[PDB]
Amino acid sequence: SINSREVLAEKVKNAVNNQPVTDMHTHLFSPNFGEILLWDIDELLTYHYLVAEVMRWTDVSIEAFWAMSKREQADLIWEELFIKRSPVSEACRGVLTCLQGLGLDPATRDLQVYREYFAKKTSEEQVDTVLQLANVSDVVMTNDPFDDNERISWLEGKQPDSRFHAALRLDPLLNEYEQTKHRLRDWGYKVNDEWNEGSIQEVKRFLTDWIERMDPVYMAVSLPPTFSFPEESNRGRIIRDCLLPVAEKHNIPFAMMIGVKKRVHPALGDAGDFVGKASMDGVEHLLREYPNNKFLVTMLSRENQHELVVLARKFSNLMIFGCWWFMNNPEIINEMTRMRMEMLGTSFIPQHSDARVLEQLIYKWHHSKSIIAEVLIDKYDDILQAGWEVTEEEIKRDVADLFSRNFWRFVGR
Amino acid sequence: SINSREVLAEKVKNAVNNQPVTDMHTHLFSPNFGEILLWDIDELLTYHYLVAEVMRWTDVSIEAFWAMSKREQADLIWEELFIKRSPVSEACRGVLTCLQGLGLDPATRDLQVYREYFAKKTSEEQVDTVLQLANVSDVVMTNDPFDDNERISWLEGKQPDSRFHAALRLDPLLNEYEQTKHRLRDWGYKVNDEWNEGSIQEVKRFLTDWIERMDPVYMAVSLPPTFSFPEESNRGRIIRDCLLPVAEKHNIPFAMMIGVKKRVHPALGDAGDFVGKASMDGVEHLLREYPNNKFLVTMLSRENQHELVVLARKFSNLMIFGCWWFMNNPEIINEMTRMRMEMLGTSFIPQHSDARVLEQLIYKWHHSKSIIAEVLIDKYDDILQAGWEVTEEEIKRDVADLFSRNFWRFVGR
Amino acid sequence: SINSREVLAEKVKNAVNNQPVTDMHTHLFSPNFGEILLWDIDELLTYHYLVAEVMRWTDVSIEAFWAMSKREQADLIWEELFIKRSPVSEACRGVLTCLQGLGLDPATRDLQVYREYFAKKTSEEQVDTVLQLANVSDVVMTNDPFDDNERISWLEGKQPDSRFHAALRLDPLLNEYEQTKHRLRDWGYKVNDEWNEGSIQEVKRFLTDWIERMDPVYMAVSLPPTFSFPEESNRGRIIRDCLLPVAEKHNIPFAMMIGVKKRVHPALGDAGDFVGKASMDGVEHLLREYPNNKFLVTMLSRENQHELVVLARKFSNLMIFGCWWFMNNPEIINEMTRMRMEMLGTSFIPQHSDARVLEQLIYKWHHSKSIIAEVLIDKYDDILQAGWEVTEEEIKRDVADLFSRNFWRFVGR
Ligand SMILES: O=C(O)[C@@H](O)C(O)[C@H](O)C(=O)O
Ligand SMILES: O=C(O)[C@@H](O)C(O)[C@H](O)C(=O)O
Ligand SMILES: O=C(O)[C@@H](O)C(O)[C@H](O)C(=O)O
Ligand SMILES: [Cl-]
Ligand code: NA
Ligand code: NA
Ligand SMILES: [Zn+2]
Ligand SMILES: [Zn+2]
Ligand SMILES: [Zn+2]
């Protein structure tokens, strides 16, 4: 029987370690989609989180950086972030965890040898390896139909294998309608100059067509700190007249990732986005006024985390998830997970990887599971000491909810 | 209900600490007996355990040491074992535990201040204080009629107060009969040169007379590693024809402390005794052949401990007790108590203090109770793990047995 | 590759728990042999280990005890060792582990209900249940052709099923030749009043006849602490001229369980045996002088354990096994298993149950595996900290050797 923090630590850690993970938000693709699925050590080293970091050290111009080959960029980052200074940051630590996880050894610092490992495998093979090592059963992708390369793959028949699920990303539609409406037109969607019946209907058609073609687990959009709702604006009207009605009809959750201020440093590309605290008014309104709609929410500002937890206490149609981007660091993951469990028990999704490069599934879940297990141990122990019987089966059940079931239960799959 | 090892631990520790102790073997005396009762920091520091230890470091010759005054010997020991080297030995640690328990501060290393504490009170006052701090309700003395000093107190009609009990110590009679018989004659005991009926009867009379004057809880003797029985020697015959039959008639247990090899280093005085493993044959014979006699046994050799425990499994007229002298060290107390509990459950007496100096009751019991508590927590945890539901009252009961009731139940008092 | 002590511990414990056990020494019999196979709660409670323990507490005379029915004895032991005092001894804890393993609940202390469970089952079923619960694949019995109740079955053709193996126990022959000599004649073995070629041939024929009837994995005998060899005694001659020769020929090992001092307390029956430290001279002689003979050895004295391990280091034809009887207590099992692994790696057999009652296989292996796993985790962790990388397969392999392969490999089966 589990009758001490010591036995508890053992059971919890084992349960967490053995629980297959459903990664509900990533930038990975089923291997049959091709090269869009990034992987290998050079890709890990050139992850944009690492581009931002190397630029704080190297004297090579950002322009010169983008001009180098992938291998050259990787060589530079390795030398600047791993050799010239100890790789202590979270993103650098992650690269090492991945290598060790693959059987490669960071002690040697033999980059050439690590590279040899990857050249000997196919995409299909590396996916099987990585999903096994990271114990991830399901991967949710981010499928942006506005990206020419992605759209053609879907239009030409590409479908993910059983382990990869789609999520319809709509940033261009919702945040750049003035420009995007012209593309909807090129694609046969007759949106008009004014927002009238015809425009509303065609935007719905667009959403419906893609829901049918992608069979997404949810519709998603990343939003700025200034997001508000209701709002007389293109975003405001599209959400109100098109997105919500359609999402309700197909019982598809609407995922909002709030807090990103795009391109504050355009030259850094993907590494050029910033963060800002958002008002909770828009979210509060959506939850209260659309009781039949489901919402998956994660926010970027550290200062929004606690009030977001309280908001989840108010609305059952709100399911909060992950420690997103700038929140995805040990110090923050820890405080967020503890505040969440303290006020929500197990009714939340603690994490997602946001993996852009296959191997990252290894370090993201490993780093995150160690922290989540420690939180669980403290919480199980507090009730154990209070006289509660905690069984191994109940721990497995709760751990299953957090890493996989709560999500599928929420999305209705 | 005790739902966790953590709660079990605190309940066990509380029970053990709160249980009044019957110390069944000491070298302390009821206060009304006089200066025979030793106490205070100078007495603590000149304990022969510390004398043997200081001679391993000091340049002072043993002759000179014995020549010094109490105070001077104590200053030498304090300086050599506490200041020049850290006082990490069990005996030195004990001195510090006593000091702290009395409210003094070891951190200052102010020996003069410590001495001032003791000069401020009377023997009766210190006895009340110490017995309170060490939570000792009953003390069993070692009463030797062959020691001129002690004998006079008894002949004077002095009686120990209710907190002190007598035990008739017989080493001289049993181990040095050839010399001792001449003293018995001087006392009116007409023992002959030949071991005839008259000699036997006079020796029994000597025993009966002191049993009447002291009303001892048991008769005792310390024996050498070569102890044997039956044996055609004064010791073997005195035990066979006098000691055992008298012990039976009075239903008084016979305590045998086996394993000491006396005076291997004469100049060290009380600090000059050694140890040796003994044969279990004599004890086995006594137990089997004298079923109506009760025996209290403790052995000096580490190598005799396990077989002594097995012998206890064989004979109910055998009660084993304590971790004697060279066995009275944490490492040994722990292995001994665990072997004993695993093969005897709670049917034994784990410890006695053997205190020669009053204050020692504090550390002797503090150090032992913590070890005994840890052993109990493990054993209790193991059966909680097996589904047994131990109650707090059952824990207090077992603790009372181990620290007090088992002894009184065995001596029939 | 295990990178953490947590993953190591999980894997080791899993390996240990799942590893089918080969119990190379018990006092159980294949169920087709009849009532000779003891089982059920009353048999557990009346195990002689508990008879010895209850006698240290109960007012009931040993005479009265033997006169009571099995149920009454069981009731008495339960009240005296489990109710009046916490059942903390190893043997008492063992009874509780057995009950819990069978799904019964120790918390209710309902002996009436526990008994009902066994009443509604057959020997065959319980054997299936227990061997399954205790994960024991093979059981080596102790087969004594001198016991009338057992011999009848062997003579009437009864053969144990494939899960039970035989061991030819020869105590009467080797230790009581003078009284056994006459039983051989009565069976057709013409041994003469003197040790001549005729006697040697008849004894050898006796061994050979039974080795033929039993096909035992080895021949065994328990010896006293005084055992020596060579020796001009019936035992010393039978071993030198008969046992060893027949052993080498059929290539079957000779198991010597040394250290038991028989019936030091006759009235206790099976609970009346004591222990003593033996000389190693005899075992050393046999190993050196009989290179072509296999010897399985276990010793009763705590004081023989370390030197026995060192002796195993000297001779490969020596296989030490288990923590026998009075050694079968956690404190000793732990020190023995650690000394053994430290000086012999995995080249030894850690444990055997010595079960006299069927269900004991549950607690004996549960209590023992628990300890062995801890030792393994510590030893594996030490090399891991040294840089060694152990695989789960190497662990399952090592665990296989300890609990089964080492034995079968030594016996040559
Ligand atoms: O790597 C990231 O986390 C960002 O660059 C984005 O992918 C962000 O997670 C998003 O989904 O908008
Ligand atoms: O202080 C001691 O333990 C010894 O010097 C003796 O008193 C011994 O305990 C004994 O009782 O003979
Ligand atoms: O139960 C026991 O362990 C003993 O009584 C004997 O069976 C001993 O193990 C032996 O086999 O000689
Ligand atoms: Cl020894
Ligand atoms: Na904090
Ligand atoms: Na030890
Ligand atoms: Zn993302
Ligand atoms: Zn003493
Ligand atoms: Zn046996």
The reply to whether C304 touches chain B by the CB within 8 Å rule is: no
Contacts of B296 (CB under 8 A, 6+ apart): B24, B218, B220, B253, B254, B255, B256, B319, B320, B321, B410
CA distance B320 to B299: 9
The reply to whether B21 touches chain C by the CB within 8 Å rule is: no
Contacts of C413 (CB under 8 A, 6+ apart): C217
Residue ID of nearest Cα to ligand 2 atom 8 = B325
What is the stated resolution of the deposited model, in angstroms?
2.2
How far does CA C339 lie from the centroid of its chain?
20
- φ/ψ bin of A69: left (φ > 0), alpha (ψ from -120 to 50), beta (otherwise): beta
Q: Which ligand is nearest to the CA of C26?
A: 9
Cis status, amide bond into C87, omega within 30 of 0: no
Distance from CA of B351 to the nearest CA of C (A): 18
Residue A131: both structure tokens together: 């999903």
* A321 DSSP assignment: B
Strands (E) across C270-383 are located at 274-275, 295-299, 318-320
CA distance B181 to A222: 105
Test the C interface: residue of A6, A10, A363 with most C CBs within 10 Å: A10
Does any ligand 2 atom lie closer than 6 A to the CB of residue B354? yes
Q: What is the CATH number of domain A38-119?
A: 1.10.2020.10
C256 near C206, Cβ under 8 Å? no
- CB atoms near residue C396 (< 10 Å): 16
Q: In whole angstroms, how far apart are CA B86 and each of B78, B109, B148, C322?
A: 11, 12, 40, 43
Residue C227: both structure tokens together: 């055992």
Test the A interface: residue of B1, B2, B3 with most A CBs within 10 Å: B3
Residues of A in contact with C7 (CB under 8 A): 17
Nearest CA in chain A to B2: A387
- φ/ψ bin of B251: left (φ > 0), alpha (ψ from -120 to 50), beta (otherwise): left
Which long-range contacts link A151-154 to residues 24+ away (Cβ below 8 Å)? A153/A33, A153/A34, A153/A36, A154/A213, A154/A214
| Residue C367 labelled as part of a binding site | no
A346 near A398, Cβ under 8 Å? yes
Contacts of C207 (CB under 8 A, 6+ apart): C168, C170, C219, C242, C243, C246
Dihedral sign for Cα A121, A126, A128, A133, please. positive
Residues 253-292 of C with CB under 8 A from B: 264-265, 268, 271-272, 274-277
CA distance A151 to A210: 10
How far does CA C60 lie from the centroid of its chain?
31
- CB atoms near residue B61 (< 10 Å): 11
CA atoms within 13 A on the CB side of A124: 3
Residue B410: both structure tokens together: 């065995």
Does any ligand 2 atom lie closer than 6 A to the CB of residue B274? no
C220 near C170, Cβ under 8 Å? yes
Nearest to A317 by CA among A412, A208, A216: A412
Q: In whole angstroms, how far apart are CA B63 and each of B78, B269, C224?
A: 19, 11, 50
CA distance B24 to B21: 9
Question: Cα angle vertex B226, ends B221, B229, to 5°?
Answer: 70
* C138 DSSP assignment: E
Is residue B105 classed exposed, middle or buried when 0-12, 13-18 and 19+ CB atoms within 10 A define those classes? Answer: exposed
Diameter over CA atoms, chain C? 69
Contacts of B77 (CB under 8 A, 6+ apart): B45, B46, B50, B51, B54
Q: Which atom of ligand 1 sits closest to the CA of residue A271?
A: 5
CA distance A353 to A28: 10
Which one of C1, C3, C6 has the shortest CB-CB distance to A13? C6
CA distance A392 to A396: 6
Dihedral sign for Cα B101, B104, B106, B109, please. negative
The reply to whether A10 touches chain B by the CB within 8 Å rule is: no
* Alpha-carbon torsion, ordered A143, A149, A152, A157, to 10 deg: -60
Q: Which ligand is nearest to the CA of B259?
A: 2
CA distance B102 to B366: 13
Distance from CA of A107 to the nearest CA of C (A): 11
Nearest to B399 by CA among C282, C86, C144: C86
* A386 DSSP assignment: T
Residue B94: both structure tokens together: 């004990």
- The label of the residue with tokens 């940033």 reads A171
Neighbouring residues of the ion ligand 4, judged by CB less than 5 Å: B 303; C 303
The partner residues of A165 in beta bridges, in order of sequence, read A140
Nearest to A89 by CA among A118, A121, A51, A126: A51
* C264 DSSP assignment: S
Which three-class secondary structure string do you get for chain B? CCCCHHHHHHHHHHHHHHCCEEECCCCCCCHHHCCCCECCHHHHHCCHHHHHHHCCCCCCCHHHHHHCCHHHHHHHHHHHHHHCCCCCCHHHHHHHHHHHHCCCCHHHCCHHHHHHHHHCCCHHHHHHHHHHHCCEEEEECCECCCCHHHHHHHHCCCCCCCCEECCEECHHHHHCHHHHHHHHHHCCCCCCCCCCHHHHHHHHHHHHHHHHHHCCCCEEEEECCCCCCCCCCHHHHHHHHHHHHHHHHCCCCEEEEECEECCCCHHHHHHCCEECCCCCHHHHHHHHHCCCCCEEEEECCHHHHHHHHHHHHHCCCEEEECCCHHHCCHHHHHHHHHHHHHHHCCCCECCCCCCCECCHHHHHHHHHHHHHHHHHHHHHHHHHHCCCCCCHHHHHHHHHHHHHHHHHHHHCC
The residues of chain A that CATH labels 1.10.2020.10 are 38-119
Distance from CA of C95 to the nearest CA of A (A): 17
CA distance A179 to A133: 43
Start-to-end CA span in chain C (Å): 33
Give the neighbor-by-neighbor strand order of the sheet with B254-258: B168-169, B219-223, B254-258, B295-299, B318-320
Does any ligand 1 atom lie closer than 6 A to the CB of residue A116? no
3-state secondary structure of A55: coil
Structure solved via: X-ray
A–B interface: beta-carbon pairs under 8 A = 23
Question: Which letter, b or e, does each residue of C258-283 get, where b requires 16 or more Cβ atoms within 10 Å of its Cβ?
Answer: bbbbeebbeebeebbbbbbbbebebb
CA atoms within 13 A on the CB side of C347: 15
Nearest to A367 by CA among A20, A8, A48, A93: A93
B–C interface: beta-carbon pairs under 8 A = 112
CA distance C20 to C132: 9
Nearest CA in chain C to B285: C264
- The label of the residue with tokens 């126990």 reads C169
Q: Which ligand is nearest to the CA of B305?
A: 4
CA distance C364 to A366: 38
The reply to whether A388 touches chain B by the CB within 8 Å rule is: yes
Residues of A in contact with C10 (CB under 8 A): 10, 13-14, 17
| Residue A161 labelled as part of a binding site | no
Chains that touch C (3 or more CB pairs under 8 A): A, B
A39 near A355, Cβ under 8 Å? no
A53 near A92, Cβ under 8 Å? yes
Start-to-end CA span in chain A (Å): 35
3-state secondary structure of A353: coil
The reply to whether A3 touches chain B by the CB within 8 Å rule is: yes
CA distance A290 to A284: 10
Question: Cα angle vertex A95, ends A90, A97, to 5°?
Answer: 90
Distance from CA of B4 to the nearest CA of C (A): 15
DSSP letters of C53-99? Answer: HHTTT-SS-HHHHHHS-HHHHHHHHHIIIIISS---SHHHHHHHHHH
DSSP element (H, E) containing A254 = strand A254-258
Output the CA C134–ligand 9 centroid distance in Å.
19
Q: In whole angstroms, how far apart are CA A174 and each of A242, A252, A261, A280?
A: 11, 17, 15, 19
**β-pair type (A260-261, A274-275):** antiparallel
Question: Cα angle vertex B18, ends B13, B21, to 5°?
Answer: 110
C293 near C244, Cβ under 8 Å? yes
Q: Do B6 and A388 touch (CB under 8 A)?
A: no
C8 near C389, Cβ under 8 Å? no
Nearest CA in chain A to C7: A14
Which one of C264, C275, C330 has the shortest CB-CB distance to B288? C264
Nearest CA in chain C to B309: C326
Contacts of A101 (CB under 8 A, 6+ apart): A133, A134, A359, A362, A363, A366
Dihedral sign for Cα B202, B204, B206, B212, please. negative
The reply to whether C7 touches chain A by the CB within 8 Å rule is: yes
